[PDB]
Amino acid sequence: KYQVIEPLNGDPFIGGFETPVTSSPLIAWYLSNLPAYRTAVAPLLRGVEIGLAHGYLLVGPFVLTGPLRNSAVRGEAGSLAAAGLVTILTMCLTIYGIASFKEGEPSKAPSLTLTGRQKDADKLQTAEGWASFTGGWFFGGLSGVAWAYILLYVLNLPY
Amino acid sequence: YIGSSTNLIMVASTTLMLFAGRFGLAPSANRKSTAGLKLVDRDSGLQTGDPAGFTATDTLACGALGHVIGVGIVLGLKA
Amino acid sequence: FASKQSLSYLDGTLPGDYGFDPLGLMDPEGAGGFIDPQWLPYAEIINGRFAMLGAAGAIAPEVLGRIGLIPQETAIPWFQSGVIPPVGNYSYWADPYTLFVLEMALMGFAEHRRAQDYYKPGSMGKQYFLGLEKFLGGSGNPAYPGGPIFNFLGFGKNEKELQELKVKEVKNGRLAMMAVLGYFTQAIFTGVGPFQNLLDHLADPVHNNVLTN
Amino acid sequence: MQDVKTYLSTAPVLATLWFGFLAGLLIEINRFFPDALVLPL
Amino acid sequence: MFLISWRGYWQELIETLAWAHERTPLANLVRWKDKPVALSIVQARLVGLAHFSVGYIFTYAAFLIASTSGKFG
Amino acid sequence: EVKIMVEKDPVKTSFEKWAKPGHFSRTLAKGPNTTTWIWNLHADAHDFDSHTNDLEEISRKVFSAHFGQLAVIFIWLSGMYFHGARFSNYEAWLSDPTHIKPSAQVVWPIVGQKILNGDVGGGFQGIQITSGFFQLWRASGITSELQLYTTAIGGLIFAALMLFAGWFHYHKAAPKLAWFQNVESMLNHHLAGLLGLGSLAWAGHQVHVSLPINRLLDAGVDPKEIPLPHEFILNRDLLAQLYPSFSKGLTPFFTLNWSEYSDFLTFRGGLNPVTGGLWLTDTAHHHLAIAVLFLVAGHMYRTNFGIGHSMKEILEAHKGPFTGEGHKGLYEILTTSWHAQLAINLAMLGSLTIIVAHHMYAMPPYPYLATDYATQLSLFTHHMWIGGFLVVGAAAHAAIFMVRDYDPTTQYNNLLDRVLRHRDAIISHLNWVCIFLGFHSFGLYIHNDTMSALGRPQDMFSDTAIQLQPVFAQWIQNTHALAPSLTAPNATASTSLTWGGGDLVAVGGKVALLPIPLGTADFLVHHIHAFTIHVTVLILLKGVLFARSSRLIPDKANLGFRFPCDGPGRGGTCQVSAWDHVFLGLFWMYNAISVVIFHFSWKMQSDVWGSISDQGVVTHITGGNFAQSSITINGWLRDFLWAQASQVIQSYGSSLSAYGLLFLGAHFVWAFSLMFLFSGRGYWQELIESIVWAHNKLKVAPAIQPRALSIVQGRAVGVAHYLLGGIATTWAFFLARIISVG
Ligand code: CLA
Ligand code: CLA
Ligand SMILES: CC1=C(/C=C/C(C)=C/C=C/C(C)=C/C=C/C=C(C)/C=C/C=C(C)/C=C/C2=C(C)CCCC2(C)C)C(C)(C)CCC1
């Protein structure tokens, strides 16, 4: 509690700081337990989870404020727009994976922990890893949009 | 009018506030304060007539502060 | 000998060296301009002279007219006589403005010579002054010209009695300065000359002091 | 007095004196010969 | 915008934008291939002239067509 | 410790350094080889800290320059008063302030310009002024041209006096560095002496002369029958006829029974119902309170009398966990560097000018001020521009300090060092918020424009379609509307009529003020204001922080504060200094202030001003079309520019012709700026050779070789012409509109 600001890993010659925002027990725990930062889990499962979350959240700003926000097709148009956005994002992810990743390179991910432990790099930074991530994200996004629409414009419990 | 309460506060406040330039109390010329309100400096340069403590400047300051407080109390007894 | 410490310049030399300077206007460290230690004693000296000459004339008409000596032209207030028109003025043999320019013309001669004797001590005894070229040389300090004219009687022969006379003069000058300041001030909160103020204070001080207006 | 003449011999001072004299000349001419469109010569 | 402001400001801005992108979580998984740099000098002049010319042509074509065809002489 | 310090006659006054044009700097004192000497002479003519290196001579020069500036201001004021005395219809204005247009300038008939002397009323013919000097003189109690003449002379005297001082304290008695450094006594004397005693003296003048004269002017008496301002000084009975409290003498003030002064020392909100201005009986009380406030606040800091604070123990005592070694080493910065003081002073003075411009329009302090719309608009626009310039100047001087006065060998005091050590974060986050604000402010306007263009207004962001009502401003308005009943029991009414509470006030037809509504059209423009201000702060703060070094150029502080570029290398490094950041921020300041003044003009003409008729019906000037037509850029194009610009363009052949001329003149100057803003030095330097050839061919080659303007002077000229053209165009447009329709 004396002096809460510190250089990164105690090394002053790197570009940043260990402020309470970046480095903190609660923040480090919340950030490590996110699917994109869980290292050993297979990329497909992380992609599925992330796509689910994003497709589920995306139905909101599309249905409430659209061009058909005042019709009987209120929710359907927004759900279709959300599905279109997630397939477009899938295409962008695919072309990024093609352009940025090779099929022979071992890994571009970091390998060490915060204390220099010789761990293993993340398999997500491989070509096939990113392909699995993209497929899982596509599936998760579609399923999340569908589930959001089901919960909203098929059943009870308005908001 | 000397016996009225309106004048009874301006004298009391000014005397009680004047009981700091002589006896170890509220800060004055020869005694400085501290971030911890220690009231321990005991250093200045000024020629007085008595043993120690009361000078020609801190009397005016004590009087002015006592007058501010006395005016505040006299105008605060209107509610 | 108190109310300040004799820091580095009020040792005790000058007549009236009570060692009083809580601000440090005679401090010789920064002295240029008009606050050097050679102009301040002179300024005090002649300001006290003028105050001694004015604090008597401010009361003289009002106190003389009570004895019935002067006709009823003596303005009981010192200020209802010309010096301030809007509160009352007396009609003399000329306009107050031509009186003013005549006074300035007569005083320019009286003051430029003194200024030149201050700035140039030995001067004002060389140039032929018109008519009788008088011996008005700068005999010593510019505040004590000596001379056979500015000292009619030669009062004060050696150092002791002369220094006593000097300190008496500076003390009376300070007293007269305070007196004329009192004149100026209490001419506003009362509206009447100073001698009448003294008389009304002598009447009864319980109901006629300053705490009645 | 020589340095005063040298200063008065500077570029901005001579410029403003010349342009002010010319402005005065033209202004007087137009106040005495106004609305001149065709030379009557 | 491209004719008044010159490169040395925009490059010193991009150099901190890249820092901000690198030092944030959840967004350093992505990564650029081509290092982001400010437009070149002659390139900036060219883009500025192109914008100036396109705007100059369009805001006058629109006016000449609308003010005339809206009245037909 | 604290004492007077003077060095007798440090510089002999003569004409020697006067004949040699370049004398202050030795680099150009030799002579003008090329023609880039005439330019940098005037450039670094006032760079006092560049000629020499000792703080003493710099401080003396600064002092004398301040005195010269004060003399010039005094000449200006005496000139304004003399013009109000000699060539003004002031006495005629006093007899009918609602039908006589102010005017204090006449034009000689020479070349047909006689028609600029328009018919302003009262048997006078002259240009109609908008300075608001007539209202100020009416509020001061001035009621005769004589009372102007004298004060004019007075000003002149002070002018000479100032000049004398300016000479004296540089040539006969100049102080030494140790004297200027006494900031404790300086602040003591500026708080207690300059502000406190000044406010007390003005409160005295008010309470003695300005109150009775103005009250008799409100009672409808002739300004010639009003007694002179001294008949209320030498007659307490003649003054007590209006405020009988004066009959009680000076006794209530000394017995603390001064609650009987409620006649002339009041606390009443609102405006005077007949003059459309504040109650002078209220401003007298305000000044009386402000005076004692500043007086008791002028005893805080320590002098040689033992007691008081010292502004070094105060600073070091504030040192927290997050912020390194606290404010240590800042008292050494603000007493050994004139620039780190000029930055703070300019920033605070600019912000204060903006506060003044915002307060005066909402609480008109002069009689018949809210009625004259031209004066109330000019006093807003002028002050806004002044503040906008001063803040940019503050930024520039902070950059200068950082460039050539900062040093780390003593600045290990981790407050300035710490903010210098995360500039790459500060600027990154400021950039992100600037982008976010720009999008979420201007994209909404583009949305509204596209929708209103696609025949679908129901999808707009109007007050009928999707709403963006600012709830916080409305809550603040409703809170201040009810203050005189719950949170201010002694104040009779709210502080202003702009709050939702209260009602309308009339000054004989035209309306003065009324509660201002706030809808979506105000939400959008307030967010636009925030966005532009943020971009300006971005540019200026980036310049200030990267004034020393950056990733591109690690040794920029060696190059200096003002330099064009470090080569065409590293891809390109043009406009990389802090001077260039100030150059870039001037345009965004111009943009911001122009948007602010457009906002104010349109909103006031649409929802505030107008002319009420009997039975209460009030019709504003434009007709309340701001809430609906200001949500699309096309609306600002036609309903504001095209519509309101219809007075200036057709002002030819009328008394408002000079505005129509200066419209096009300022347009020309603005467009002329682009030649310098777009081009570059090399082309012109090359072109000049082909002219020097023709000159040599005829033996007219000058000896001062004609080089072209430097890369920095081109930018300076460009931005100067740009600002002049823009501001003069807006000046002409605003005046030619409001004078005719207001
Ligand atoms: C309290 C106000 C104040 C003070 C005392 C200073 C003082 C200083 N500034 Mg500064 N400045 C200020 C406000 C102030 N500035 C503001 C508000 C800005 C923002 C625009 C700037 C921007 C600024 C820059 C960018 C620079 C300075 C520089 C300087 C230094 C040299 C100035 C010089 O020689 O100019 C000499 C004066 C001139 C050459 C006059 C130029 C003419 C002007 C631009 C046109 C005026 C137009 C006029 C209003 C009307 C035009 C029409 C008419 C002419 C026909 C000096 C210490 C320079 C420096 O290096 O500092 C060390 C520098 O590079 N200042
Ligand atoms: C009208 C002209 C114009 C415009 C639009 C801009 C725009 C911008 N300037 Mg700028 N600038 C200009 C003139 C202009 N400048 C000039 C003349 C100068 C010289 C003084 C400068 C000097 C200057 C500086 C010094 C700085 C800027 C900065 C900025 C940016 C601020 C961030 C922001 O608000 O983003 C919002 C962006 C917009 C509102 C642009 C319109 C976007 C539309 C509404 C969205 C379109 C939808 C979609 C994307 C279209 C797809 C098309 C596709 C289908 C074909 C922004 C990009 C600052 C910066 O970089 O901060 C980030 C900065 O530091 N400018
Ligand atoms: C011990 C001794 C003694 C005793 C003591 C005493 C008696 C004292 C006194 C003193 C005093 C008793 C003091 C007082 C003071 C006062 C003052 C110094 C005042 C001030 C004032 C002021 C400052 C004011 C101001 C104001 C106003 C005007 C209004 C508003 C508010 C106020 C209040 C702020 C004796 C001397 C016998 C002897 C020796 C020894």
Ligand code: SF4
């Ligand atoms: S400005 Fe001068 S330096 Fe900077 S790029 Fe253009 S030419 Fe090279």
